[model samples]
Target: QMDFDAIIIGAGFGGLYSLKKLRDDFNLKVRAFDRATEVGGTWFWNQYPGALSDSETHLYCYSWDKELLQEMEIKRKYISQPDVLAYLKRVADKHDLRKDIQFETGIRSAYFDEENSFWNVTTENDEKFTARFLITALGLLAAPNLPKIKGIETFKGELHHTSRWPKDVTFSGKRVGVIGTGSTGVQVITAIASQVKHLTVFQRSAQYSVPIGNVVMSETDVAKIKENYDQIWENVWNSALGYGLNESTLPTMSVSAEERDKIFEKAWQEGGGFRFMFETFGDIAVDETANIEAQNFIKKKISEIVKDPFVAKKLTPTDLYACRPLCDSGYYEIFNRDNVSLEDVKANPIVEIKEDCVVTADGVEHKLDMLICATGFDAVDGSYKRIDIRGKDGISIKDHWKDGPNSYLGMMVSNFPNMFMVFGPNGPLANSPPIIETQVRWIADLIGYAEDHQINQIEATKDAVDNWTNTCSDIANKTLFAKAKCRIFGANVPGKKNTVYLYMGGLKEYRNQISEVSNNNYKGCLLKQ
Candidate 1:
């Protein structure tokens, strides 16, 4: 009666893993759907020049399969977008996941059939599907959020969004105008500047980006990791931020000035995210003075790199470091190029887009041949909002999350029966891959339990959903993230409610809680026939 036992959306890291587990481990008939022509989710589509992972590549992969790890070794500490995509394809081939995937198929809407207890999913091509379990593996940052600016459609030249970069685009010898200064924007600017004639950067907010000192791993280091892979995973599982780095015990302000500078210098040289934040001090996120110390160190770095005093000051961030801490390779140094220019949107905001140029608020128009919008996604809720998903009694998911997203452990909605979402609403903010793997394992384990026990549906009680939401809110409110997010686009994104998007509590703790719940036979889930 149904196409398969379960239908999964998206073919990214989460979707691929889910398909492998469901088809290989559980022996369930599963079908994977992706809009892209290829297997990689974000990696497949985001081929913009210089696009790469912010997280280190070594830890960005799957740790559950030993054979998979043994088959390939990530040469670079941080791999470029193409390398990541190639790696993903290799994984899919090794696991034979492509055969089960339906490429170029996008889900338009999915409605729950109350009488039959199935989801009637419709694709963009008007094809229909019925599935007992519908898994929305749509990633957190999958959807790009384009700004609503006047005359944006009237641009006559080549226009591109970083998330939706055309596969066949060539930027050689083109005069480019890049807008926004987030992580993607920085990477694109850095990569495109080498190929383009000139690059004009429109910076709205200054970002605090640290150097990403990427290097190839030595054979000895690889051997050491392969020898103790289990122990390494155990160490990562016990750590605070879900990576192997140990958290600092002393507060940043409590240390001597010399000791503080030494610590900051060490983190700066080590070159990666979370290491700079967690390795520096214990209360860097919560303590205002401690945060200021880190900001000052970054400002000092900017002053050392940028020769122009005014440009250095404009680039130096005065706001909280956690708001938008970028990991960069020669990003600030690129400004030293005579061809690159920075425009502060706060001082000279864009009024409109003319036929061949951008008009500023001060009524000055600068001509451009190509325009790129590197503005980030709506994040956590964008993927869900893009679809018309109806749950119990035809209540739309969009209407339900009109205020904000509500979930039980960031995986399932209260009224959404037999639906499991990977990397969904309130997943741990740091190290997304680990959280994805954890959620996949949890969902798989639950599905196994239900099948083994002859259960047809599983849903969270209203009280359970309410308590989880409150708990997530409380944990988020206690951190420096809550304070910093209150001031920035994290909460201030247009039409987005001012609730914390991520679970601020560390990944290990969240896992422990899930483990406890599962050990108690999933006390939070309501199992029914």
Candidate 2:
């Protein structure tokens, strides 16, 4: 009756898993779409140098396939861009997920047909598709936001966004200018500083990044991971941050100043931003005093590591340490090199970009052969706004989220019947894959239930959405994260409304809440027969 049982938008971890479950497990006709020519969605797009997973290698993958997990050899503590992409490609090949996917296809819009109980989807190429259900695996940070700088197009130099990095492009002996010092900016600066003739880092805000503690994986490590796979996943599921680290039960104030310093010092050496924040103290994100304790430690480390006091002062972040924590490999040490220079843009803003140079407010022209903009994504709800998604009563997604983005449990919206989202707004604030798997499974189960019971439509109620959104806001207000002006709170994008986009409740709690709703006959959802 419909063109397919389901239409999936994206071919990343969520989309691939959704395809597997709906097509293979539930015996549904499913089609997927991706803008990229290849699989690996985010991995495919994010091919910049020093692109590495912040999460550890073992926990960053699919937990469903045991044989594949045991057989595949990932020899890095933190997998790089190529490694992650290869792993995703292997998974796609193993599952035969590519045949139905329309690569190089981008979505123009999606409209729900209230009369027919299916969705009418249009591609950027003007192709059409109709399916009973629509699943969007559009990642949280998928849509890259290019800053609106004056005279940007006049730059004759090779200008590139980190999300769309060029292949075989060399910075060796070339003068490079990089704008933005967020996570991507940090990684790129660290990777290319040694190669470039002269590098200028235009910093708007300084970041507090810890060492990633990456290392070559040993056979013993592999053996231990394979052996303890089940327990590892279980532990991940129950945790708050979901990086498989032990959360400290001890509060920061309980310990002496010396003891706190010792713990912070040890975590710094051990490396990992999440490990430092969560494992050292339970109250870092919630309590102001605890956050400052950790923040001061990182600032002190920056002062100690960087030889130049001026550079160290410029690098120090002066905000709450409540944004998405960052980890890097030798990011601070790169600034010590004479070839690399720091431009505190916040102090002296970028006025314009000439044909071959970036002119600052100080009227100095920083000449460059190449310029990279690591400005970051609009995040969470950015991709949703790009497409003109219309739901019941012809209400557009933009109109529905006029105030801000909201959803019931970060999956289904109120008016968008038979449409679902993975890693949607107000999703779990944890390591991605584990939460992705959990949501995919839940969505699959819902689809299965719909099929079995002959339900024509499924949409979240307005009350449910309101309640969920409030829940998200309430939980976020209790933490320091809501107060921080960073990407986590949607402050990175110009004109984007600042609100809590993630469910601050632990993964365990989120899983339990979703399970409860599912157990109670999909509470807060309207299913029409």
Candidate 3:
């Protein structure tokens, strides 16, 4: 007999909702697990300075709970890590989700029993649990990717990854060295520039980051947002990306140069990277000419903002403005401060770390009290490969994803019957929570249908998986994002397959696909009744 109807492997946005929906709505016995001591998956882990949501406060939260959404009002335009963690905690306790979740528990592996038609899951502690359905909410950015630079362990100074930051650690008057210039690095750099005695940014690549014009929300502003919550969510669901902004229909090249700058300036003033990317221009991602135009504007701005020509030259990116468009608070301007220095690590490369200094290939020793690796996660399929997951005939997930990860709409894998992934490989390239909510709902619905139809197992067909992969590839090929040498295409993870891991197709389109399949009696799924 199954120990439970469903077992969810995460306590973050996906798992929390899966547990709530499956148990509260479907009345199924369920349990959730997380390695963290508390709720908030990614939020719980990241407590570093300037750890904040890239998406807007209103858009970052859950839309499924209307009452909670209405009651919870954000006072700021952007929410930091603490704000997000507090919100997730409130959600868990408010709906009684904490009672069913086992905290500080990490799942070691899960295997499907072909004869029994149930999943055998084992925890890191060697505890066993059996459930009819196995759902993995292992987040997209869960697996921390540390740099393999030599002498990392030899460093006597305090070292930390942004994902595994220590609580209440102060950087006052400490000479800090931050590696990587991705979103996390940008945020940390901007936040701690003045506080640190001296800050050295080891940049692999220069970033074209827009200003995140974050401000405190007024009461009227909060009220208006609350009033339009219904329409806002609908807009988010229908839009290309899940950010609640209206992307322009007019092409960037169609407008005059003066008009283009005017448009770009307005979007720059009212910030959000996704807003600047999609909201300002219709063809920025797909058309090279449009991308160049946006890139030129940013480069020109960087030259103008930073006083030092040498510093500005080092910071300006010559690449396509196609990678995850970054938004930051005074990112480029921070370099103007004498306390902050930029090291072009891509050109000079990190040689090694001494006990108290990072030696560069150029023979420059950057003495530091602390080092922060903002080098982000392995992302998407990375966490899956770490766990020992076996489907039919004891096929490991590593073997299944040998060629790279593919799936039926980023949810169900071909051989892994009754196993589903939220924000799995090839999921929508959009705002995290909205897509997370969408996938969670779809998985819940699929499970509900399977149960109602007396189906003991459900798996994606191999053909469906291949077709989905083709669909993702085709869409990515049409855009410049596929060409960018950034984390978007697996460039961040060394030797990781540089493949299209996200469905470039819009979130609205993905929802429609999910609906079409469901209406057609879940066509791609092989249900064993």
Candidate 4:
């Protein structure tokens, strides 16, 4: 048995940051745990070729330490998986964070004790742990989701999910078939197209992908960012999205067609994930006609990139844009390679998998040496659902949120006392680092307040959770996100409830709401002394 002030789950950015904030700054005894053998939660698993973060390298990392920022120089505008992992390891080492974190040891269950005001946490190895608080540094997309196909288990060839790609596995000179055409699939296809003898991409739906303008960052690049770390962090905190950049307040269709075309052309040429939609206009996601304009632009761009006419038809998305905008690195142009073949699974679905090959709906068997499921995660709520978490009166979070996930500020739940979730559903929608840091800070602050005020338990009221969840829905329905037929609603998974998982509101707006609640001593929440 072990005891601590807080029990933190997942050693990702959130966990690491939360531990640093509590243990170092607040002088609290906290222990963090992750399923992986090391830190870098998301970076640890996504080791597929061409896997890189969409956020710019200079801005994605921690801004608290100027010396660390200056010392750790990124070679590219964006960072790869290995580089990110290494960077995270370096951060953990610099902060001496590993001593307080238990690796390769995941929690099996956690139950809150009503009388003691503590949580009894049980690990997968049967080790018992107890803590006054439970901080879930759970990721938004940690749980890799595989589709429930008839012959998924019958595949005789080497097959794996991109999220859990084996370290030693290779497809050199082998025929590879990749299913799903999301961001991961696009990246894998673009990278493996030249390496593999033949690559078959079984795409269910074509997604909009803007070019990720990647460039090698030199000393000058690092120096350019190091000029004003304080300002960068200030802007990061000031903006709700936490990216240190502001989106246009004007509507997409407000400007003249020629002017708008020029604006979009410049942004497309410059290249970024959100600049196309957010920076271009505010109404793209809010207004139907405005969103179609951005969607049309991407559809037209696909035609220009993919040479073959039939393939272009297979690659164009028929849905509205901005559900989850994906940035790409040579994603569209990879189809020009002779080794790459686009199999429209939506048109000719896969019926079954033979020992050596995959049989299409029309009974044509495509032979492959390896199959890659670049399928996405169950997203926001899946990671939470995997754990057996029981709060007051043995009420499980799984059963409580059977229909969909709901939280007050995406931080605390109704029945869960002295527990907090970072970057979960109903949290901010923006650049991850700022949102993560903000949420972690807020949770820590609340915990600190409890200690100073002699409070035993703290939980958001049922009314607060209900109000936030409904506000999330009402705000999401106002945008095009509510209409998207993709994984954002858990639609990609079989038999999963089709419901909106994100708050879909502005990041700054959410922060303001959180601040108001915090300033009011966490109004609409239950605090016991």
Candidate 5:
């Protein structure tokens, strides 16, 4: 049996960083496996027309390495997919992480051997390996959620998903029908509207999108951050959302409407993801009045951009803005193009996919040369469930999460021994990069703790996982997120259960809880064997 100290199941941002730290700092024997031939994770897979990081370039990167942070320039405020992938590659090269990585290899099943205190991993190609610790850095948004339309296989025209965009693909002069109007759909439509001969966007619901005023960072600005690297990291750690913003607490709603508008305008102009909300009088996510104000502001922006009054009205969101933070981008204006058309699926639902066209419920068949499924991933739990992970007593991950994913701090499960999930269930969906970094470091610290205590197996208690899951649900129920679940993660697909995926508790609170548990000798996790 092939064995290693640790077997990392992905090569994305989380996996790569974990590999570097575990090998370089902890000096552990680690083997990283990835399905992709390269190291970018989500970026590597999603090569769609406009797949870019929602988080600003500066905040989205790793803050651990001061030299890397200083040397590498974030050319754009919102870096594109290619640039981000290149940066990941550069990071891997800088750390010499290529030698330890196994490219184009995916783990099919992992079974923990109780007696030996090791995991037996089997690959799809029948390759076998063993490891003491099985760390699933499987990305939260790795699995693509495809729409189940009748006659999808019979379609003669080209069919593709944004997550699986072909390398040699071109949209120029093609009559393209894009299904789903989520973040990916919005970006793809905006990026390719000018180039495509005709573009039809199938919208189920109108999403709140803001203008992404993406621009190149000045050398002076980069230098200032580099000089204050330590202070910057301290700020990030201390902040409510782990992002290094100046504000610690959200502003009170006691302010006047005019004052609130001014605050929002300034934040809007500042042009970074989520920072605008932080700048705006806080409690926008919880307070309905505050949320309405933000929604109205975005609706007004959309009205100004889209020339067609009817189309603009159709595109406007009536739901709570705080449910999904208003995604900032030049999205609404893309519809103003002569070639672009928005087909409301709610109005005329998709009936089937004809050989060379899309047949809607209204009996209208729109001819298309190609169809792009811009539908997003199963998200959060999908990647983890993809692996056949058998825990204590032969409990499968799918069986465990049959009702919903139950975990403590979104990291450790009840029956899983020596298994740590990075950015797992109940994880902070907002500020993903920061959350990812926190998880990696947290896992590393736990490993250190386990080794120091001479413990081989660690798992969360069932009661602890239950309590944490309840806490997450309670926090989620307090905000507009509860209502938006039906729209976002409720799985519009058939046979998928409608369950809330992320932890809605504020990031600062979650971080404090994790720290408290660790300091208190990990109250939720139990050590044995």
Candidate 6:
């Protein structure tokens, strides 16, 4: 067996840092593996035009060292995919992490070794590893999905999925057809609208987007972010969605509609996705009346910006604003272009996809030189389901999650000993980078405790799993998020079960609960000495 004290599956933000934490702090032999030749997780694979982080560049990264924070300067308010990927590489280089990481190697399967009290980890191509701890740094949104459109393979033109877009592909002078209207589709359409000769956007559902007012970074911007490192991260740790911005407790009903408009106007200009949603009003995501009024305000804004009334209506989302709360740079304005167009696929229906053309239910054939499936991933459980993980009873992890993904505290499963996942089921939904960092640190703390106590293995109890599962659903029930047809409820993919995949409780509460468990000597988990 390939020997190591710990085997971390992923070299992204989580895996790279987990390896560093174990080797430097715990002094445990650890090796990290990623399918990519480099880091960046979602950023590593997504190279589509206009791909970028929704979180501001400076806040999106790790900076445990203030010196490193001041040393590394990301010269943008919003970081693009390329810049983010490069920044991760710089982190790897600075920490000398490449040696500990086996790039281009992917985890194929893993099973707990009951006798040895270790994981029998298998990698692609039959490579096996044995480690006392097996941690999955498998990030949310890493797995890609392409809709099963009939005759999709018949397209003779260059085709691509936004999740796995080719680095060398060009959009200029091409007839581009993009499917799906989530985060990636919005970006791809906006970025290519001006560049391509013709762009046809096929939207299954109209998505509401906030404006990301990206601006040139100045000395003032840099200065503002520098001195408040501790406070900013404190905000990230304490806030609801795990970023610095605090949600307003004020009821939308307390303020006049005009006053609310002014507040919404300010937040729209100030920039951010969910920040605009949650921070502007306390009841926006909870109260149906409040959410409707807010959605209408944005719809009116879209109508005002987009010239044609028909296009405006098509672009407007009738559903309550939800999902990760997408913000865009001129996403509304892109639809106003002569070269750009929209197709209401729900009404027309994509009946057939021909080699050189797409035929709709209305008998219209739109010829295209390129197709982009901007469809999103299976999210929380996609990466884990791909592996054939077995527990003490030789029960596959897939079978355990046959109803849907079920994990206690988003880290450990009930029966899977010595196994852990980062940002999986029942995980917190927030600005991801800090959440990943916090979870890894906490996992490290628990593992360190187990090692010090000479514990052979650890796993959550079934009661703990059921309790946490109910808590996750209860928290989501308090929000309008569960009602929306979003990937959070697994509604994006056909035939996928709809369930509460994350703990909708604020980050502060979630972290405190995690602390309480560890502080009380890991109460919900069983430890074998």
> Largest lDDT belongs to which candidate?
2
lDDT of 3 by residue, 1-529 (tens): 8899999999988888888989998888998899888999888888888987888999999998899889886979999988998999999988999999999889999999998799999999999999999989988665789999989898999899998888877888899999989899999899999899999999988988998899999999999999999999999989989888888887999989999999999999999898888899888988889989889888889999999999999999967565557889899989999999899988999989999999999898899999999998875788898889999989999998876787899998988999989877888888888888888888889888888889989999999887887787788878887567544455334654445688888989999888898899989899897
Clashes of 2: 0
Alpha-carbon TM-score of each model against the true structure? 0.95, 0.97, 0.97, 0.95, 0.94, 0.96
Model 1 CA lDDT for position 455: 83
After superposition, candidate 1 runs with Cα above 4 Å error? 486-498
Local accuracy by lDDT, each model? 0.82, 0.89, 0.88, 0.83, 0.79, 0.83
Candidates sorted on lDDT, descending? 2, 3, 4, 6, 1, 5
Cα lDDT of model 5 by residue, 360-466, tens digit:
99999999999999888775677878889998999999988866676888888888888988777777655777787888888888887777788888889989887
Per-residue lDDT of model 1, residues 177-197, tens digit only? 999888889888887777777
List model 4 lDDT by residue over 142-216, tens digit each.
Answer: 577887677778888898999888888776889999998888988888888888989999999888889888888
On a 0 to 100 scale, what is the lDDT of residue 65 in model 1? 82
Q: Select the stronger candidate by lDDT from 4 and 5.
A: 4
- Prediction 3 TM-score vs. true: 0.97
Off by over 4 Å in 5: 246-253, 326-328, 486-500
Task: Return the clash pairs for model 2, or none.
Answer: none
RMSD to native for every prediction?
A: 2.3, 2.2, 2.1, 2.5, 2.8, 2.3
Could you tally the backbone clashes for each prediction?
Answer: 0, 0, 0, 1, 3, 0
Candidate 3 weakest lDDT stretch, 10 residues = 490-499
lDDT of 3 at 356: 92
